Amino acid sequence: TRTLQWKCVESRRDSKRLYYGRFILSPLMKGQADTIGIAMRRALLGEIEGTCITRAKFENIPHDYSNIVGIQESVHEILMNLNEIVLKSNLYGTRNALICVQGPGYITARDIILPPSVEIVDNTQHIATLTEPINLCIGLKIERNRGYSSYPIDAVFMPVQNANHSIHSYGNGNEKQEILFIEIWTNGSLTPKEALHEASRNLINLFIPFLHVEEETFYLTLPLFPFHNKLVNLRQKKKELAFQYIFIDQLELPPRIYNCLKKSNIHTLLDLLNNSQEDLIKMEHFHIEDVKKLLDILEKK
Amino acid sequence: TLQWKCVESRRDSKRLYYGRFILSPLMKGQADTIGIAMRRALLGEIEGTCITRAKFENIPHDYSNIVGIQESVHEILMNLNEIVLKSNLYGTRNALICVQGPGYITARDIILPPSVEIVDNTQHIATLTEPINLCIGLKIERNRGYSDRSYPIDAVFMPVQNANHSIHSYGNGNEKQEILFIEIWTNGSLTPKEALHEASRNLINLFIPFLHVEEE
Amino acid sequence: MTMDIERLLLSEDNRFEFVNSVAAEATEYVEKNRDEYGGTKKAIFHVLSNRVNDLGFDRPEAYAESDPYKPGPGYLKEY
Amino acid sequence: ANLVFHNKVIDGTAIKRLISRLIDHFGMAYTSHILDQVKTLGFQQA
Amino acid sequence: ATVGGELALGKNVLVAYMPWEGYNFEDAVLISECLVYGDIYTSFHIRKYEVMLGSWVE
Amino acid sequence: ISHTYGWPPLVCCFGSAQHAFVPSGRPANRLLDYERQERMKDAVWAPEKYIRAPGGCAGGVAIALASLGGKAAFMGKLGDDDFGQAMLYYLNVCQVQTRSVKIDSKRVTACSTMKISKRGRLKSTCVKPCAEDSLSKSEINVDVLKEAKMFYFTTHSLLDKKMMSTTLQAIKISKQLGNVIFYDLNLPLPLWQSLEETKSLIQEVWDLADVIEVTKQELEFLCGIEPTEEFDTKNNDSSKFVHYEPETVEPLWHENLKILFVTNGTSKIHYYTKEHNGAVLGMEDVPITPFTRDMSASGDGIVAGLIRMLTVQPDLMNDKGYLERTARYAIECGVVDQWLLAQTRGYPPNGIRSITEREYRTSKPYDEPDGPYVMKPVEEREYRKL
Amino acid sequence: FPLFQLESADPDFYKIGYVRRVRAYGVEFKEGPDGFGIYASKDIEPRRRARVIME
Amino acid sequence: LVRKLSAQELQDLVKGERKVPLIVDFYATWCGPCILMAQELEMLAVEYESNAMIVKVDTDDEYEFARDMQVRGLPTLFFISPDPSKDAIRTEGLIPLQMMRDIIDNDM
Amino acid sequence: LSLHRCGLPREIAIELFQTFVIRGLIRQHLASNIGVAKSQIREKKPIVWEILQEVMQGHPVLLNRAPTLHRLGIQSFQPILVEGRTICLHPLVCKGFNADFDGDQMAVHVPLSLEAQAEARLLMFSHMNLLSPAIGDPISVPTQDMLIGLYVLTSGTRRGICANRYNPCEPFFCNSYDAIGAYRQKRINLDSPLWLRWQLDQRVIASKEVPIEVHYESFGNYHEIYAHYLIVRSVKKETLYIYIRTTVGHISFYREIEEAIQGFSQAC
RNA sequence: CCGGCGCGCG
Numbered sequence A: 001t002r003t004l005q006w007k008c009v010e011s012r013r014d015s016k017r018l019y020y021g022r023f024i025l026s027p028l029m030k031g032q033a034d035t036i037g038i039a040m041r042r043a044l045l046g047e048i049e050g051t052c053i054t055r056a057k058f059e060n061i062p063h064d065y066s067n068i069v070g071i072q073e074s075v076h077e078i079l080m081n082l083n084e085i086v087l088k089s090n091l092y093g094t095r096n097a098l099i100c101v102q103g104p105g106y107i108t109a110r111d112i113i114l115p116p117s118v119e120i121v122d123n124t125q126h127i128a129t130l131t132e133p134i135n136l137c138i139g140l141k142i143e144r145n146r147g148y149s150s151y152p153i154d155a156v157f158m159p160v161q162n163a164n165h166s167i168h169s170y171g172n173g174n175e176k177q178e179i180l181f182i183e184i185w186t187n188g189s190l191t192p193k194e195a196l197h198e199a200s201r202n203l204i205n206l207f208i209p210f211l212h213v214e215e216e217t218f219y220l221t222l223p224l225f226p227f228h229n230k231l232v233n234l235r236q237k238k239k240e241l242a243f244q245y246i247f248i249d250q251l252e253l254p255p256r257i258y259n260c261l262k263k264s265n266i267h268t269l270l271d272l273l274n275n276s277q278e279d280l281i282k283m284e285h286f287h288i289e290d291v292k293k294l295l296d297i298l299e300k301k
Numbered sequence B: 001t002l003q004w005k006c007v008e009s010r011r012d013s014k015r016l017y018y019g020r021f022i023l024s025p026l027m028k029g030q031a032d033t034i035g036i037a038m039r040r041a042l043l044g045e046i047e048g049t050c051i052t053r054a055k056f057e058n059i060p061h062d063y064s065n066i067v068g069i070q071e072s073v074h075e076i077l078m079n080l081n082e083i084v085l086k087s088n089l090y091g092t093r094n095a096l097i098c099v100q101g102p103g104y105i106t107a108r109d110i111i112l113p114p115s116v117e118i119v120d121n122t123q124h125i126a127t128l129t130e131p132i133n134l135c136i137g138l139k140i141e142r143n144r145g146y147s148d149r150s151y152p153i154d155a156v157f158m159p160v161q162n163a164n165h166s167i168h169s170y171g172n173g174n175e176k177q178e179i180l181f182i183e184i185w186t187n188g189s190l191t192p193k194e195a196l197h198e199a200s201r202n203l204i205n206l207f208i209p210f211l212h213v214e215e216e
Numbered sequence C: 001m002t003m004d005i006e007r008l009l010l011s012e013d014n015r016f017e018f019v020n021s022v023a024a025e026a027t028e029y030v031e032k033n034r035d036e037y038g039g040t041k042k043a044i045f046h047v048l049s050n051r052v053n054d055l056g057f058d059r060p061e062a063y064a065e066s067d068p069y070k071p072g073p074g075y076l077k078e079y
Numbered sequence D: 001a002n003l004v005f006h007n008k009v010i011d012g013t014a015i016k017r018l019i020s021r022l023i024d025h026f027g028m029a030y031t032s033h034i035l036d037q038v039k040t041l042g043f044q045q046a
Numbered sequence E: 001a002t003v004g005g006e007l008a009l010g011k012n013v014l015v016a017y018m019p020w021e022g023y024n025f026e027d028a029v030l031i032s033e034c035l036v037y038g039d040i041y042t043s044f045h046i047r048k049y050e051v052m053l054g055s056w057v058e
Numbered sequence F: 001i002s003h004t005y006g007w008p009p010l011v012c013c014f015g016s017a018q019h020a021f022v023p024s025g026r027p028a029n030r031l032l033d034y035e036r037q038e039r040m041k042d043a044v045w046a047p048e049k050y051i052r053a054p055g056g057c058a059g060g061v062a063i064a065l066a067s068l069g070g071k072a073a074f075m076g077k078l079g080d081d082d083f084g085q086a087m088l089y090y091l092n093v094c095q096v097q098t099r100s101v102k103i104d105s106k107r108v109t110a111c112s113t114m115k116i117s118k119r120g121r122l123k124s125t126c127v128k129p130c131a132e133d134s135l136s137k138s139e140i141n142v143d144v145l146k147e148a149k150m151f152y153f154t155t156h157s158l159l160d161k162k163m164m165s166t167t168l169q170a171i172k173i174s175k176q177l178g179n180v181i182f183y184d185l186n187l188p189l190p191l192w193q194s195l196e197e198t199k200s201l202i203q204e205v206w207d208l209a210d211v212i213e214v215t216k217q218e219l220e221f222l223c224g225i226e227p228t229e230e231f232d233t234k235n236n237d238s239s240k241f242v243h244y245e246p247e248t249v250e251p252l253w254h255e256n257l258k259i260l261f262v263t264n265g266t267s268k269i270h271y272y273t274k275e276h277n278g279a280v281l282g283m284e285d286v287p288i289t290p291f292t293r294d295m296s297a298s299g300d301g302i303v304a305g306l307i308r309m310l311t312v313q314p315d316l317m318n319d320k321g322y323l324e325r326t327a328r329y330a331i332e333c334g335v336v337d338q339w340l341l342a343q344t345r346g347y348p349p350n351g352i353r354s355i356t357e358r359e360y361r362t363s364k365p366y367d368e369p370d371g372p373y374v375m376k377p378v379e380e381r382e383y384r385k386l
Numbered sequence G: 001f002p003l004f005q006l007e008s009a010d011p012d013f014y015k016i017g018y019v020r021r022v023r024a025y026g027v028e029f030k031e032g033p034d035g036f037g038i039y040a041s042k043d044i045e046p047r048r049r050a051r052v053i054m055e
Numbered sequence H: 001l002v003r004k005l006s007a008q009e010l011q012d013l014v015k016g017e018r019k020v021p022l023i024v025d026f027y028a029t030w031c032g033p034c035i036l037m038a039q040e041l042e043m044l045a046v047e048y049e050s051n052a053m054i055v056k057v058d059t060d061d062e063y064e065f066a067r068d069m070q071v072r073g074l075p076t077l078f079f080i081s082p083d084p085s086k087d088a089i090r091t092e093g094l095i096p097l098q099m100m101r102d103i104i105d106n107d108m
Numbered sequence I: 001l002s003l004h005r006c007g008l009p010r011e012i013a014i015e016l017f018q019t020f021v022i023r024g025l026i027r028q029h030l031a032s033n034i035g036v037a038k039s040q041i042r043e044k045k046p047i048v049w050e051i052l053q054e055v056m057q058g059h060p061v062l063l064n065r066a067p068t069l070h071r072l073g074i075q076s077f078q079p080i081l082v083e084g085r086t087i088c089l090h091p092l093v094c095k096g097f098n099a100d101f102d103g104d105q106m107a108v109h110v111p112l113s114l115e116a117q118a119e120a121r122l123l124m125f126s127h128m129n130l131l132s133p134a135i136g137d138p139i140s141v142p143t144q145d146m147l148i149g150l151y152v153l154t155s156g157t158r159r160g161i162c163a164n165r166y167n168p169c170e171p172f173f174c175n176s177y178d179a180i181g182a183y184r185q186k187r188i189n190l191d192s193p194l195w196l197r198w199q200l201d202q203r204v205i206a207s208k209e210v211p212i213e214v215h216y217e218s219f220g221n222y223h224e225i226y227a228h229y230l231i232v233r234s235v236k237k238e239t240l241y242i243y244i245r246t247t248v249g250h251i252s253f254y255r256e257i258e259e260a261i262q263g264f265s266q267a268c
Numbered sequence J: 001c002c003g004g005c006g007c008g009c010g
Ligand SMILES: Nc1ncnc2c1ncn2[C@@H]1O[C@H](CSCC[C@H](N)C(=O)O)[C@@H](O)[C@H]1O
Pocket: G034, G035, G036, G037
């Protein structure tokens, strides 16, 4: 139905923690594919957030470079294994999880007691192996963040492993259209389609602030109310309104003079008073008769 | 909160506008991506209006010069390529030049389609000495930058002459913050604030389709 | 300031004498008003600006400038 | 500035000769800024 | 510095040979953040000095 | 003074400058990805019942059109009280020409004295109207009507008899001066029952309009069609987005009608002419907040985009490609406006407290000692066997 | 508020000098019936040392 | 505290008698400005602990009653005077709290 | 970095300027005495770095490499605070120091008295030491990477048999800004030939050669075609049009130098 | 807080 369409031309789950997806987007006007590709690549590699363990707490360890009797792996190896756990969550904040098991056996990623807002991507991820029945209690800390970073864990938050894109000529140069392909590799915390959608949303949220109102435009959720409060305060101890807040619309001017002031970027009474007669004379359709009648109108105010 | 502001504005002439804009606070790495995308959009995704074709009527014999005109045909075309226009036109329209005789032919002597305006009416086109009527049929188009005996004009659709971005970083310990600066130079057919808004809208329109869904 | 320093030496027969006179003037500035210098205002910069200003060319006092875009106290610009 | 328009090549000998002529004509303060700009341009094109 | 019975003093990293904005001027090397947060070139260093065990001194 | 009329052409928006006032809201269907909705249901807020408002007031459309770079003037009345002055200032700083706004010192802004009958069931029987209902025919600014090339108005102006007379006079005057009349229905709340009296009220203004914009629900109501589709079901079947044939909209057509726009939010916009008809698909998976759930900002943006594109190229009102591009532009404008409103208002947590989307998507630490996510003292451990 | 409230020499005379590194500071050239002359185009504030007028 | 009351209960309340101003909120669950007005009314009821009564009537469930009151949209407030001689005030839109206080202290 | 600036590590800077940081702390009443200020410096308080940054402004330092073979082996720079533990050095001053970035180190010195600071600022800064005292050649000349960049930029068009496969039996731009804008929009390459309208005097370095071809029209106008430019002249009028055949690279080099001069002139 | 020896870096 749509003239410009997008579709997933290939989806592949090579492993539990490595997803692949290729997407198409055609037809694009010449130069649009390059902009979309570069912005999408930078968003995928830098703007997508992930969740991972950032802090693990032990109880009977002198330092992270020591061993535990009954566990094959040292504390450093356990921390390295904990750093490789892939989690998924849509929420922010420093959630905490718990590892509370008794050996012997294998401690996999499905042994983590997670809060309801966090999920495990790969159940089979290894943490440690218990050879004898020793107690093992580990308290974990999980938060959602971007980029990368009780023993601290060097957490890498980027869930997109790699990205690629290509641009191909659509065909005859009627409008010299183009075809865009995008390849995304993720770690399973989100699908390549989810990564594409999240990158689009993040880019839009990055570009949309310029479409807001400029800083220091309204008087300081509902910009109307603070100015109403200012007017209410001005009603008591009557001091009238400043010329900056009074616009030339509310002053009775002939339509020609109003248009002349408007296209000269004159909007408020303060701007009108700051203007000089010579500058207004420089602007056409504005003769000395207009100058004197405008001065009379301002005097009447 | 994330806000933007214009920190500098100037108008050196009618065809040279400058503006400097700010955007803060931003996270690490965001300002560079925003600046790159905005610069690309400003340089090529903004539509401009230019004269793309000229037809010489009154039988000029298809020679290098016309009797009574100081400037040559190639010189006239080069002069026409320099005229700055703004419009909202869709498709292609036509403009005409009909100057009676001796005097100076400027942009002011162009009969324009409805939506087309002229940024500078003092732009010179041709000089006439002897009283000969000159008939030129101009073809006017509106296109993106990245996009019968009639002489073509190699128009470059660049309303934004130049664009730059710079990053200022600040921090006190573990919390950082960066500021984005964007400089825009336009040829007067559009203000730097208008250029910024148009670039943002074009980028957003470029990234809307990835969120499209289809009827089942 | 580099252009100003070059301009000031265009009228000096000896540059060593110029440096000595600038140092003496800065020393007098520091002795007269000790607490005004050492921070955002430097005595040698003030001397150079005054010598440039004495010719009739307006310059900021001691070439003292700050960043209007600092996001509040405590934030230090990272190069 | 009445600069000549080089249209052939800028090699090591040409840039050394050009800088020396700029110091004589413009001075060390002007040429110090020209060197800063040319350094960026050469790095940007490499 | 030994893997599988062989001397292993370094790492295999993706490398390009091109000038990049003067940050590899003369003999400088420009590297990626992946080598940092990936712990590709992280080494343990231990001094000796003639305090509780497992303490973070400063 | 036709030589002082610049570009773009001026647009006169006739009506009331209300503050966050919604005419009505009908059940609606929007295009959505439901796998994402299921996945992000704990972080993305959605209404249990999707109900869409057709838009807002004429002042909102004037503000939205100005934000698009168009020239907009608001014709209406405001009081001299603090609320009226604040509303006038807000319109002024939004680059809306307020020289056609009449200021009345004897009227109260957004307040009407009402006489309730306390014998039978209570009626209210409006006695003294509000400030933005008392614009007389003599207070109509004719200069802006000469300058303007398009006249915009809504059905909220036909509720009061004096307001209806003023609206009729303004429409007729604009028609004499060769303006294009844009009628945005935006059916008010009391008119959604007894279709016959709605037709009786809007019959005269309907025949004086060159461009008419209605919602899908409004078109079904005016054509006597009972919605047979299903609401609030997690799918995107084409029965929810049906392009009615020109025969369905045939009874509503008249001699001077040029374009009829049928909008389904930003999901789909249908355009009808006497020679071409079609629809353009859009996008409605924008951020929505309990403070922005009515989706009236999208309607205002759509109408503003339609007006902007129709005014910039008025000779292409019959061009099919230009109509498709206009519909796409209106969809984009509505999407942008809804996104901006969601960012500005923020989520619920003048007494008005709001939290950002970042705070809304922040969970509790779950560090309760009784919780199963904290290292309890060794007395109570409850190890699980491997 | 701003709203409520001897001839100059040939510009080419100074322009031909100006394009050849002639600089005049705070003064303008004026012509009268007697002849040419140099007059202060503004108020020259007395500084510590002598002020440069022309070069 | 604002209590959700039906058409007949409001019938009884107005046909009865009271010594305090009555503010009736006409709202719908699908309007965001209705939620903002609810926050404003909750703050006002905090300010007016017992000297005023604020009630809410759902428009979607009392559409005929809302039409009988000439409610032309949402949010809409009705200020009912305890004195039968005085007239009721209908406010359209998200009016500020100061207007509410001015109405209650001037024409209530 | 600028030619007159260097980057100082935070630890080196706080060590060298310790007394000045103590004075800055005490002066604004943020330290009770010298001991309290020293304790604050030892704790790396966030306000110590503000005072250090303030007091380093306008105070030069002297850098020095180990084998000082001539007087340019020690130079003065304006220190700025850079992150890390390394000294940031300008690339154009490495030849004077005989320094490369493969393990070299430098010593930093702080002039304390006002006379020493004046000497360092007015005699030892790199912007007044552009010439070598041995014979007078420039010492801060672009080298290596910058030289290759300039050589590639100013390497002109492919010509002759390296441009056309067969024996031949280009865009015209009003100004250089149009040509560079077309280059930005990927319409032309860096070394693609183009014709540039020239509105100045003939100042293009070229071989002293007569025109290859003169196209004389019977109406009076004649076109003189040289190897690198085209000149249009007439016998009726005094008009004279010049078009230069060049690339974007030559235009870019000329604009870079011209804009450097104009910006320096405007900034003063 | 003194000197020898060995190994290195530029
Ligand atoms: N104070 C004075 N009063 C009248 N004439 C003067 C004068 N000082 C100089 N002149 C005249 O000016 C001449 C010097 S050249 C000075 C400018 C000259 N008047 C011109 O218009 O070109 C002398 O010939 C002298 O006659």
